[PDB]
Structures are given as C-alpha cells and as structure tokens.
Amino acid sequence: MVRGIRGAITVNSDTPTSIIIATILLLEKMLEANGIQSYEELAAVIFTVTEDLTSAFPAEAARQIGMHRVPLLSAREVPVPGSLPRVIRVLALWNTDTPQDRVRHVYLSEAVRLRPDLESAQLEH
Amino acid sequence: KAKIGIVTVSDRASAGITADISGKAIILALNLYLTSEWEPIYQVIPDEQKVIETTLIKMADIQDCCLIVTTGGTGPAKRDVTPEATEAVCDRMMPGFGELMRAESLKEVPTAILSRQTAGLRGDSLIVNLPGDPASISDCLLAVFPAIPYCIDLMEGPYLECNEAMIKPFR
C-alpha cells in the first residue's frame, strides 16, 4: 500500500549550493505537508533534474539531512523545448493508507506553474 | 566562536501565518560554505522600520555578530523599509554589494532594478540585504560572500573558514 508524492522546485543558477538548498527545501516541505515524522515511512525517493542542472546530485542533499537509509535515485528529465528551465522534480514513494485525494503535493518557487489544474483540457473520445 | 545574524522581515511570517523559508535558506547556505564553529542568531520581525533598526543594533553591538543578513522588504512597495533601516544604523555604506547583486539578478530578471538592497557597516559588524525569494537568496549570497570573510578580517573579526567545494573566498 504505497502512495507517490510529487514535488518540484526551481533554482536560478547551476551551482552545487543552490541545488542542495533547493532540494532540502523541497524535501522538507514535502514531508511536513503530509505529516511524515520518520524517514522510515519512505520506500524510496526519485529525483529528476533538467538538462541545465549538472553540478551536484540531489541525493547528496538528501544525505545532508540524514536520509542515508532512504534509497535514492536521480535521472535526467526530458529536454522539452520551451519547458520550464532548471527544475528539480521529486517522486517519493510513501508507505501509507492515505487516500489519493488527500496526499498533498508541493510546487515551490517558479515550479508553481507545473501544479496541475483540475479543470483543464480533457477529451470527448 | 563566531556569531552570525539572520533577520527575516515579514508581516506574514512574524504573525505565524507562513513559515520563514527565506531565513531557512540563509541558514542552510551558511551551514554550507562555513566549516568553522558559528552560532546563528535568528529573528523574525514585522515590516516596521523602528523594529528593524533595534534588531540590527541588538545583534551587532550587543550580541556581537560579525555578519548580519536580512531578507525581505527591499522593494518599492509602501511597506518595504528594510534598506532605510539599514542606512539609519550604519555609519558607512558598502555600495559594491548592491551594485553587484543587482547586476547578477538583472541578467535573468529585469525587475532587479526595482530592488533597493544595500549593505553597510556598524562598528565591526557587516550588514547585507537579501531579497525575499529563496532562489535569489542563494544567488545573491553566492555572489557577495567570497569577499565577506576577508572583509570581517579587515575589521579584526573572527576568521571564517570555508568549504572549498561549496564556495571559495578571496584573501
């Protein structure tokens, strides 16, 4: 019984210090928004960074707040032209019986645009 | 030991409506860079000029902070009065800090010219204004900080040691 939790945040330059700070900010606001007390509830955490962020692994930031026992994995996001630049995305798999409608997802800094609209698009088909 | 002041100027955060988040970023950034022992002195206060002046003087002259960093209230809005408070308590100003910070945030955003951020000196204590948003806090701190440990040395303050991998100061 697992629920994914999405996060997303942006930085203004490709430096290790700004990637670590942003990731820690995003991670901590994600845990607080759902009331996670212990990292033991996380089954794994997955990060994606855009093509223009290469100076540090997000996993390095995770271990700075003591997530050593949490399985971490990072990858490159699809380089879509005109998409929002310099964005760290997070997918945390969470062991919980929380209903999907009740899981809070976090979009910070410029990434508030990536927040999904409940009344958008959709098809007749 | 060494003491550094973090001041968040926010009506909303002072009341408890929102989390500081900008101040959390300044503390995170200082926790990187610095490898030497230091104590963070941290307050959240409203957009009230007299209160900011008191808070800066309390940290610089009484609690002996060598460096004080502010976030918030640097724009053209009627309530934003952090820079005015900073010039009141400062004997001497450091125009280079504002000049550089606006030249870096102006590359990406044209509303860097709306910033009134400044920096100055009170006795032996250096005070720098940062903006509200955390992504720009990281860029501004990263621009002006390489000169700060040397600057504190020139004022016979604490020696600040740095993590060469997170940042490299000039001496």
Report d(CA A18, CA A112) in Å as an integer: 18
B45 close to B53: Cβ distance less than 8 angstroms: no
Which technique? X-ray
Query: Structural domains in chain B?
Result: 3-154 (3.40.980.10)
Resolution of the PDB structure in angstroms: 2.9
Residues 6 or more apart from A56 whose CB is under 8 A from it? A16, A19, A20
Domain ranges of chain A: 1-114
Report d(CA A67, CA A71) in Å as an integer: 8
SS (H, E, C) chain B: CCEEEEEEECHHHHHCCCCCCHHHHHHHHHHCCECCCCEEEEEEECCCHHHHHHHHHHHHHHCCCCEEEEECCCCCCCCCCHHHHHHHHCCEECHHHHHHHHHHHHHHCHHHCCCCCCEEEECCEEEEEECCCHHHHHHHHHHHHHHHHHHHHHCCCCCCCECCCCCCCCC
The neighbouring-strand residues paired with A44 are A93
Q: Which residue has the tokens 């005015």?
A: B84
The DSSP code sequence of A18-79 is: HHHHHHHHHHHHHHHHHT---GGGEEEEEEEE-TT--SS-HHHHHHHTT-TTS-EEEEEPP-
A93 close to A44: Cβ distance less than 8 angstroms: yes
Of B25, B105, B165, the CB nearest to A21: B25
The secondary structure of residue A116, as a DSSP letter, is: P
Class assignment of domain A1-114? alpha beta
Q: Do B135 and A12 touch (CB under 8 A)?
A: yes
Among A9, A12, A13, A106, the strongest candidate for a mutation testing the B interface, having the largest count of B CBs within 10 A, is A12
Q: Which of residues 80-119 of B touch A (CB under 8 A)?
A: 105, 108
Q: Is the Cα torsion angle B136, A103, A93, B18 positive or negative in sign?
A: positive
Residue B139: list chain A partners with CB under 8 A: 12-13, 18
Establish if A87 touches chain B: CB-CB under 8 angstroms: no
B59 close to B53: Cβ distance less than 8 angstroms: no
